[PDB]
Design a protein around this ligand. Sequence first.
Ligand SMILES: O=C1C[C@@H]2c3ccccc3CN3[C@@H]2C[C@@H]2CNC[C@@]123
Length: 130
Amino acid sequence: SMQEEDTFRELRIFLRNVTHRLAIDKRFRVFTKPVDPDEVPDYRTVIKEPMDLSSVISKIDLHKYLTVKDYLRDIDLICSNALEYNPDRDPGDRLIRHRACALRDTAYAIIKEELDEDFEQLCEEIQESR
Ligand SMILES: O=C1C[C@@H]2c3ccccc3CN3[C@@H]2C[C@@H]2CNC[C@@]123
């Protein structure tokens, strides 16, 4: 229905606003763009599904996310890729892990405050009906 297409358009507006607030935070610059194959040729042999905030913006616009749960799976994949690729006691590795945990925690905190639980439940019930 028209009501249902309006629901998904509101979800896209909400997700684009959250994503741009993450992407301007100086701590999260390393998560804003795909890893350059050149600079890190080893990255794609270890990390089987790369994800970054620019790709997330592209996916919103392609209608890839019909719920906030499916959006948060890609934020979780950004964070878990960084934890897996940078696991050592080095200060460089510990700094990126600290930033990756802060990106995940910041995303979940914005959504907990600003998302209405009945709005997400409606998206989940339209998705289940298709
Ligand atoms: O989850 C929301 C969405 C909306 C909002 C937006 C930014 C910051 C806080 C809030 C709290 N509020 C309003 C409207 C909704 C009613 N009680 C929870 C609820």
